Amino acid sequence: AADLEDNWETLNDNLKVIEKCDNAACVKDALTKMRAAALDAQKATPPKLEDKSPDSPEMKDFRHGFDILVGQIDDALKLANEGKVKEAQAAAEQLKTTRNAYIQKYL
């Protein structure tokens, strides 16, 4: 689905931005766009799960992954708002493990 692809690309491009950021505002802005992308992608049905039921275990698993991902973005956003550039970057790298094991397999 087009919207879902754009939100997923926004999530992954803005991860790259975070690692090469030099200040806190850079990190916070990237996390801002990841959060708004994750809020939309959270609601979508990935194409591999189009036929599934919305209460299927795969859709439950897809939605729980984005709950974790949104929780992780919020943790990193808390660190960026305190000025802790490096800790916010370390908290951003945590998203990669959730992305692979939970969400990427369904896209």
Numbering used by the authors: 0 to 106
What wording appears in the published article?
Previous studies showed that proper introduction of disulfide bonds could stabilize the flexible region of target proteins and reduce the conformational entropy by locking the protein into single desired conformation. Here we developed a comprehensive disulfide bond prediction algorithm that not just increased the success rate of predictions but also improved the quality of crystallized target proteins. We applied our method on two proteins which were previously determined to high resolution and frequently used as fusion partners for GPCR crystallization, cytochrome b562 (BRIL) and Flavodoxin, and verified our prediction by solving the crystal structures of the wild type (WT) proteins and mutants. The theoretical and experimental results both indicated that with relatively lower values of conformational entropy, proteins would be more stable and readily crystallized to higher diffraction resolution.
In contrast, the other disulfide bond (A20C-Q25C) locates at the edges of helices I and II. For BRIL proteins, the simulation B-factors are consistent with the experimental values.
